[PDB]
Design a protein around this motif. Sequence first.
Motif, mmCIF file in Angstrom:
data_model
loop_
_atom_site.group_PDB
_atom_site.id
_atom_site.type_symbol
_atom_site.label_atom_id
_atom_site.label_comp_id
_atom_site.label_asym_id
_atom_site.label_seq_id
_atom_site.Cartn_x
_atom_site.Cartn_y
_atom_site.Cartn_z
ATOM 1 N N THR A 292 0.864 -1.136 0.000
ATOM 2 C CA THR A 292 0.000 0.000 0.000
ATOM 3 C C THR A 292 0.924 1.214 0.000
ATOM 4 O O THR A 292 2.076 1.079 0.184
ATOM 5 N N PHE A 293 0.403 2.398 -0.315
ATOM 6 C CA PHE A 293 1.090 3.593 -0.219
ATOM 7 C C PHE A 293 0.078 4.687 0.105
ATOM 8 O O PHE A 293 -1.145 4.485 -0.044
ATOM 9 N N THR A 294 0.635 5.857 0.430
ATOM 10 C CA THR A 294 -0.114 7.046 0.805
ATOM 11 C C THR A 294 0.564 8.227 0.218
ATOM 12 O O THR A 294 1.770 8.269 0.147
ATOM 13 N N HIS B 127 -4.802 7.548 0.522
ATOM 14 C CA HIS B 127 -4.272 6.273 0.832
ATOM 15 C C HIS B 127 -4.746 5.249 -0.213
ATOM 16 O O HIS B 127 -5.937 5.169 -0.523
HETATM 17 NA NA NA Z 1 0.313 3.251 3.193
#
Ligand code: NA
Lengths: 206, 186
Positions: A19-21, A63
Amino acid sequence: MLPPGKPEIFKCRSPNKETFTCWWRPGTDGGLPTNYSLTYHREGETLMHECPDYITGGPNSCHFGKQYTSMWRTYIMMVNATNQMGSSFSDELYVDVTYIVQPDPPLELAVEVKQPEDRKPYLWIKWSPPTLIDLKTGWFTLLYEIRLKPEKAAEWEIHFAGQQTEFKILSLHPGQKYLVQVRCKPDHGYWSAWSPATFIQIPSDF
Amino acid sequence: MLRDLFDRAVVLSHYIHNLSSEMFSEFDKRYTHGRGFITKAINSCHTSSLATPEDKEQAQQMNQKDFLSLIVSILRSWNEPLYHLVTEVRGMQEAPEAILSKAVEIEEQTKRLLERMELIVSQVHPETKENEIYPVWSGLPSLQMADEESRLSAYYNLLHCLRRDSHKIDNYLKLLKCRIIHNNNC
Ligand code: NA
Ligand SMILES: [Cl-]
Ligand code: NA
Ligand code: NA
């Protein structure tokens, strides 16, 4: 009476390649925004998408959960700031999850003095990886570094621990107290923040 | 002795990605720092048409024999552009020395990695198809363009693509080592 100034997506990070933000800042010298909309598309597709999750990363963030995140594929993203008087778009940001990997700090740092026989005594350091990192499949590879110093020393001593979650330190000054910290980085990526310090008195008998 | 081969394969791949990453940075700092080269890099990689896992779940869904064959196809496909990158850069009168150095080393190390991978496939899947199907790179005229913006852009894309595929190959070899040697208990 003014429309928003030009916003800027100033940072993206992935803690575990899953995941990334990303985070943006409003422009100054425009009006106050009443809404932001972050949209993007991905290399080799024409479909436009909107940020899937404006809540989890806190203020002014997007997100991307697992079903929205993949490696080795450029995201081309933009945030617009709007209010009643008009709107303003950020510059487009080109982001690839492959290159913004920065793990959280390691966990459970613990330190112990150990004194065996006819063998140098040592300081024994142990820790655990951040949670939600997938090491056991080899999807993720983590490297660690320890630092330690007594109070008032001008320099830290740094020890590369490679992929180990424990380390032995031999040359400590008898009776001195040490601050010990640990950080980690992917094989390819950025170092985490140093973990909180643990303290250890090295005994007189050394 | 799978364990030794895998360890050497992973050393080479991790090293190749590090060099490719540094090559691309210097090239970018030095020659393209200020223009929309990044925007032209979109969808330009010759290995793009291959069906490659893009996240951990896809990786796990791919069985080992196909996975190994995939790594080998990608690596075999980079031998041509690495050969021409070195030949072209080396034949310049004022070739960037840190850049040329890295290209030569990646070229030679990539051959070594592909040798280990062929040994790994022979050891782990002794009776595979001896099938070579890999995607063709055919970007030499673009590197050879006289028009400099077009030339620097073709180079940018090549180094961007190498930076990506080296990272991908390194990551897939790390997954397979854990999978094959340690049953996913690394
Ligand atoms: Na994240
Ligand atoms: Cl860093
Ligand atoms: Na938000
Ligand atoms: Na995903």
